[PDB]
Amino acid sequence: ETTALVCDNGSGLVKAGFAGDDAPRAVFPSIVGRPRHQGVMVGMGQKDSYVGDEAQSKRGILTLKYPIEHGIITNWDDMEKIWHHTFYNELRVAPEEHPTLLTEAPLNPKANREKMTQIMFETFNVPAMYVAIQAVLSLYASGRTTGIVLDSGDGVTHNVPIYEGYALPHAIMRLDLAGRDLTDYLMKILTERGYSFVTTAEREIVRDIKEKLCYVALDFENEMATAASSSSLEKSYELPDGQVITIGNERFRCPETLFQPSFIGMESAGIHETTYNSIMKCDIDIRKDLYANNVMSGGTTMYPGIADRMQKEITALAPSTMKIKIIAPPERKYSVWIGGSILASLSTFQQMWITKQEYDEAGPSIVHRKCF
Amino acid sequence: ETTALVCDNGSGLVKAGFAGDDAPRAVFPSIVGRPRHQGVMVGMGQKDSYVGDEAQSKRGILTLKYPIEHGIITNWDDMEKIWHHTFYNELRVAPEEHPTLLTEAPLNPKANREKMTQIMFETFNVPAMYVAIQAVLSLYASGRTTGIVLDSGDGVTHNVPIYEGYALPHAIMRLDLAGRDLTDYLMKILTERGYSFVTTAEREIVRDIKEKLCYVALDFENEMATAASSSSLEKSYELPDGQVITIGNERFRCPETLFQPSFIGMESAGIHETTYNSIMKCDIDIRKDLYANNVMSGGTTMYPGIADRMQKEITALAPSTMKIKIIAPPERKYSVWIGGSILASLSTFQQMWITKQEYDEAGPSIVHRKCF
Amino acid sequence: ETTALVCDNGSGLVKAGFAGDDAPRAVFPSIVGRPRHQGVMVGMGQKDSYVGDEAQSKRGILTLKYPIEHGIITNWDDMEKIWHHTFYNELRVAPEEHPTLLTEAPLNPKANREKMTQIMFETFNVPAMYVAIQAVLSLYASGRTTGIVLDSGDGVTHNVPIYEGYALPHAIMRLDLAGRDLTDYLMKILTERGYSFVTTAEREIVRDIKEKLCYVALDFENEMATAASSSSLEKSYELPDGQVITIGNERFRCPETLFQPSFIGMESAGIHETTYNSIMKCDIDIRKDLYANNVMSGGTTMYPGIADRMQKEITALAPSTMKIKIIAPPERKYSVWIGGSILASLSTFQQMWITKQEYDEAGPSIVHRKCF
Ligand SMILES: Nc1ncnc2c1ncn2[C@@H]1O[C@H](COP(=O)(O)OP(=O)(O)O)[C@@H](O)[C@H]1O
Numbered sequence A, B, C: 001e002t003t004a005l006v007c008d009n010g011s012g013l014v015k016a017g018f019a020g021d022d023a024p025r026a027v028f029p030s031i032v033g034r035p036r037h038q039g040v041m042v043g044m045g046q047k048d049s050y051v052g053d054e055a056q057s058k059r060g061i062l063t064l065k066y067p068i069e070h071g072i073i074t075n076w077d078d079m080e081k082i083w084h085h086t087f088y089n090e091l092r093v094a095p096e097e098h099p100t101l102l103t104e105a106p107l108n109p110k111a112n113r114e115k116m117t118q119i120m121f122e123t124f125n126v127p128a129m130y131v132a133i134q135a136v137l138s139l140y141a142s143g144r145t146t147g148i149v150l151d152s153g154d155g156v157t158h159n160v161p162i163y164e165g166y167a168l169p170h171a172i173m174r175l176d177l178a179g180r181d182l183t184d185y186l187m188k189i190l191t192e193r194g195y196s197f198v199t200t201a202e203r204e205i206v207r208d209i210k211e212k213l214c215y216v217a218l219d220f221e222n223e224m225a226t227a228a229s230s231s232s233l234e235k236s237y238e239l240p241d242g243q244v245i246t247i248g249n250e251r252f253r254c255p256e257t258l259f260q261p262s263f264i265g266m267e268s269a270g271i272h273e274t275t276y277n278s279i280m281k282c283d284i285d286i287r288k289d290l291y292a293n294n295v296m297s298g299g300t301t302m303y304p305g306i307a308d309r310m311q312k313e314i315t316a317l318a319p320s321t322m323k324i325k326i327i328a329p330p331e332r333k334y335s336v337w338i339g340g341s342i343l344a345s346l347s348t349f350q351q352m353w354i355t356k357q358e359y360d361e362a363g364p365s366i367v368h369r370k371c372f
């Protein structure tokens, strides 16, 4: 009778909802905003901190901080604030009568999940909770069993291969290059056209510009030549103070960092080579099914050229006798939450919860014994 | 009214069917596979063991083990699993109403036969059972009564001479050099070209390469010279992951171990010398008939150069006035099963079964006093 | 009158010197570094590539590549750079008047040895060159004739048994698991404590951490329990930028892959099982002498728990009436070079060189008819 709660706490967004639903009920940015100026009007119910959409609406007088950086919770008081807001203000629910399912990026510090379990059991004390890997939930949402999931969000980009329900943990690859780094690089290269964005609110503006006008090119050199030749790739964006900026090759130079990380001085390979190397680390007999089941999840995969570019690159890397399919569902921005709702509604999962009694007996160390 | 069952349990393959048929109904690999990677998805009916074609089709996440090694059952739980699979899932029969005929290589340990009888009477209890030697079944299938049978399979290569229905057990020669050793030698010599196959799953790939591309050279030195001079003996093979590997002299070096065991460090003589030595241990009055009635059986005799090579070698060893003939029927891979089905259907064999009453009276030791 | 050169090119280090000596003259890492950032100061003697110690010293602005992977030369221009550095800059010698001895792991591709011969005779033209197996040299340096050598370096781990100077190639075992794999595994498992090492410059830092702080436990479960109980096994390491990290069970979990390869997803057996399997594949009359003469060589055998652990494991596997003795000399990091210098100084070896006239007459294939 007691329904469960699925809460995906990503680096940039929080997606919370109820188990068994098709879409998350609450989606809001994971920011805590604090006033930086002097208050002069007495009364009027001024608060010392702001969370979520309230921080975004008043961001012109606030400094915004992200409690999660690269999938790791850096500030715990702010994260506790975010959880309090998502339980009592958005979902409008009492945490002490609902089991909770949370998510974790692969190859993360163990202290992160230990303190997550401790806060959930000692501050928002729940009957049960479960910490799950995001790529497995994305595969649950896709409805299939074999596939290699590339999950790219705001802090982390990771590839995880799964075959017939079994993971190959030695082939999991993690890259700390995601949407926030793309926002930073776009911010840096906008200074070539005279536009100066420095503050935290201007970072939100640049992120909005990236979400609106950026795309992944099929061929980088040809698009550069086209942008140099004619003014056909230039788009105009209107700022909140009515100013209009015009961007050209920066529309496709920003997500190209996903394929050329050396644009921001990193030594790693692109996401295509990382995926290919993750497939080559697996057994030979499962590579054929891995090539045809590339599943893309997360908001950083929403650029409207990324599937074709990925297919072209992996086809250039893979043998010519192989069929390569890139799976990009239209609702892949919410794939982790949809998979968590699918998993938490299964009758075969109800014995895999971490109960309050087990936590009391074992302490904040059972999260490694019961969760993979 | 009760139909008899014929099950040939070799080192590599299980050939099971009903007596009176022309071909075995169920031929499947004799392996048990178990998961080695980490299962991350719940439900979906995951099993803790896979047997037969289900293990081979899913081998990329499994470790594969052969219960039978060199014709001796090493693991008995897995052997019971194989027998259960071949009685229920493949043959779709209830063993409580069908006598069973089984096969055993010459010069085997007694305990193997004893435990086979005990399992067949106490786990899959049968009205009666029998254990037969493979070479007499091969000579039954060949249709003749006199001849020398060279049976080479996956674990054992044995020569048995028979004259007018009487065997000479002192001339029986057993050699533990068969198909698995050839697969291992091919795996070793494929590293000369940079190809690495290490795991148990890749052993099956190398086995397929051996079954498809290898052959026996009529003269080994001239074949080596031909391979060194021109690239006319090279063949390409496409791997499961789409890689293409080219092999040259390894096509005829791998089965050359049958004629030169010293390639794998074995001091024994070749198969031709073993056949000649078995013939020369017999009486002088039967060697003329044994020379002209050489019968081959098993899957190791399926290389497309072995009959001519054996004829040439034995003609080199034998007197020039004798006629040497090699009998290589196209169905010789299934010769043991065909001979068993012919034998189990005879009206004079129904008195030679080991019934349940006699097993209760004598225990698992009547298999020596009733089976030769 | 011409002094012979002894050069050992492993996967990680180059040990070069003159025959007849006791220690190699030049021991330097086998890496080539190339700049990855933008040069802004004109002139100043900037080079396009760096080799050896100079590449390691300037690694903060360089990308470092290993020309040899798993004992196989993957890049040949970098290999020519390494050999030019070790001939003209380190040894300070002219190659045209010194014969050269090179080493190679067992079960390598033939093309590697052929191209080594071709490069040594056509680019660094030597009067003579000879390629030898590393384990035979280790037995030469050990002073004895009978023994089984376990040589583990940076790319390969191979077992070679020798009895009275005769080798048994069918019992030679090779495992592609060595120091670099342990470095990668340590990089993976240091992420549990929040440390992120990604770039190739940080791989050397992790290698230094492994060389200074890692060790092999005598009992794995007991040491895991001890680490879980108290913080007595924890050690601190200072990073190049002054940061201090602390590691606990990661000290002994990293080399345990040599005994449990499944930690990195490999299906193979541990080094103790591989040594026991190599002993069991030999003749029965030499196993007693192989048991008492386990010879350890290579830098991966330098952990301060590995001899006792190997003795315990082999004594567990071997019959109780056998004397198992592990021979781990203090200078076993340079056993290959010492054996090569011993062999190249023998008067009975001077007729086994491959002169330039023989190479001209036969081509780059006499290295198979002359070298074992
Ligand atoms: N349509 C889009 N095009 C490009 N980038 C997008 C788009 N939508 C979202 N993003 C990026 O995705 C990131 C967040 O995606 P998501 O995975 O849903 O959140 P989280 O990373 O917190 O899980 C943001 O940094 C944003 O810049």
Ligand SMILES: Nc1ncnc2c1ncn2[C@@H]1O[C@H](COP(=O)(O)OP(=O)(O)O)[C@@H](O)[C@H]1O
Pocket (backbone or CB within 6 Å): B009, B010, B011, B012, B013, B014, B152, B153, B154, B155, B179, B180, B207, B210, B211, B212, B298, B299, B300, B302, B303, B333, B334
């Ligand atoms: N066409 C072929 N060429 C060469 N070898 C073959 C061929 N077909 C099967 N084999 C080998 O025969 C062996 C098994 O043959 P068979 O005697 O029928 O089974 P078992 O040895 O279990 O009795 C396998 O090891 C396989 O490698």
Ligand SMILES: Nc1ncnc2c1ncn2[C@@H]1O[C@H](COP(=O)(O)OP(=O)(O)O)[C@@H](O)[C@H]1O
Pocket (backbone or CB within 6 Å): C009, C010, C011, C012, C013, C014, C152, C153, C154, C155, C179, C180, C207, C210, C211, C212, C298, C299, C300, C301, C302, C303, C333
């Ligand atoms: N004290 C040590 N303890 C453990 N490992 C070591 C130690 N010193 C060196 N190594 C390892 O030995 C490897 C190379 O050893 P060596 O065999 O001398 O070189 P190569 O493998 O190139 O022949 C390196 O990868 C290094 O990690």
Ligand SMILES: [Mg+2]
Pocket (backbone or CB within 6 Å): A010, A011, A134, A153, A154, A298, A336
């Ligand atoms: Mg996410």
Ligand SMILES: [Mg+2]
Pocket (backbone or CB within 6 Å): B010, B011, B152, B153, B154, B298, B336
């Ligand atoms: Mg057989």
Ligand SMILES: [Mg+2]
Pocket (backbone or CB within 6 Å): C010, C011, C134, C152, C153, C154, C298, C336
């Ligand atoms: Mg070495």
